[PDB]
């Protein structure tokens with residue numbers, strides 16, 4: 001697999017290059033307005049995410065069925081970590097898009113949403129206090145894509161993951177961090193993926209409720225949702 | 230404090246002897262199955278483990294340094310994750326089998342539950358191929374307790390210090406084991422990525438046993454009803 | 462809470 | 471079949 005032959009800096013470049021763009025979306029209150037906007041945004045983002053995933057080294061080497069599985073398992077985590085990343089410079093704000101910043105006071109008007117808003121805001125601040133770097137971020141994203149569904153079903157994925165770990169370390173080293181600071185930062189970053197997974201699961205549930213409680217959902221969105229059933 | 234002023238070896242030592250005992254189920258081969266009854270075994274087993282987990286948490290360095298409200302929060306958040314990783318650890322040497330207890334070995338062929346079973350089985354299989362060690366396991370378990378649920382919120386900073394502390398212990402353990410720097414970093418990541426899968430299994434299970442409750446069938450101890458309710 | 466008291470004890 | 475099958479396929 002080509003991924004395994006890439007150098008740390010080649011790996012970082014490929015990820016930066018595969019990066020999707022920031023898409024654009026009336027202060028949303030009420031389930032309809034907010035969810036209409038959130039789903040529409042996610043719909044378009046999913047098409048970019050998919051073609052992004054295809055440009056993550058090693059991913060393309062998997063069978064189509066395996067690619068499908070990983071995407072189905074990680075899609076919401078990948079959307080959320082992107083949202084959290086975009087919101088770093090906006091404390092107490094969720095930057096769904098350059099023209100759509102929400103705070104918790106808007107999640108308040110949507111049953112069982114504020115709790116998840118708070119979780120996302122907390123992760124965002126955490127990313128911030130850590131001075132999380134863009135190159136670090138892309139590495140975390142690829143890790144989520146490859147890891148989240150690896151046990152939901154192998155060697156190949158595990159090595160590529162090891163490869164990505166080498167890349168994170170390489171980056172912190174390039175940034176002048178000591179050995180101790182390197183393995184400490186590495187652990188901190190990865191501990192947040194657990195929270196990312198948590199927010200995805202709670203979000204997935206909230207969406208199932210939204211689905212059955214019938215805003216309209218795209219067929220793609222409906223399929224990604226049913227994958228988690 | 231004291232938790233912050235411990236050597237990696239002292240840290241590993243504390244966690245090891247703080248370990249809870251392996252409890253027995255009430256499983257009886259001469260007794261007929263049933264999805265409901267078989268669930269009664271699991272809930273009963275889990276309820277008794279919780280009482281031991283509560284006292285184990287108290288012996289996790291730096292955990293008692295926290296206010297009671299923060300201790301409750303961390304427990305409510307991690308209780309099922311901790312049962313599941315303990316379960317996975319117990320089942321390492323039993324491929325295709327989940328050792329809920331010495332007298333209760335189950336394989337995927339049993340339950341209504343299979344999906345979550347396969348996730349646990351897959352995780353246990355992960356431990357085997359990694360050759361996960363007991364010293365490493367107790368670290369992962371204490372990390373879950375402190376991480377999963379993390380004004381005066383300086384407690385947050387305290388939890389982080391302890392977490393950094395345990396990270397050093399993991400690395401310390403891998404180094405003494407003869408791993409190269411690259412291998413240490415890689416293994417550290419591999420162990421921490423597993424925690425993500427444990428969180429997933431916890432959330433799947435939580436939503437599942439929520440139905441069992443509403444399904445009004447399986448008995449749930451008032452403590453389980455509490456813990457569960459914390460996630461709703 | 463049951464967990465709260467258990468923690469106290 | 472599924473839409474994801476197609477989009478990834480491309």
Ligand SMILES: CC(C)Cn1nc2c(C(F)(F)F)cccc2c1-c1ccc(O)cc1O
Pocket residue numbers: 035037038039041042045079080082083096113116117202203204206207221
């Ligand atoms: C709308 C849905 C397809 C995606 N989504 N859902 C979110 C939720 C919740 F509904 F699950 F509660 C909470 C917070 C953000 C949510 C998103 C979402 C995430 C990132 C993004 O770029 C767009 C989104 O709609």
Ligand SMILES: CC(C)Cn1nc2c(C(F)(F)F)cccc2c1-c1ccc(O)cc1O
Pocket residue numbers: 268270271272274275276278312313315316329342345346349433434435437438453
């Ligand atoms: C019974 C419940 C309180 C604990 N539980 N639940 C489990 C499930 C599922 F019901 F969510 F599907 C699947 C596999 C294990 C489950 C456990 C459980 C976990 C560890 C343990 O030591 C005892 C258990 O009952």
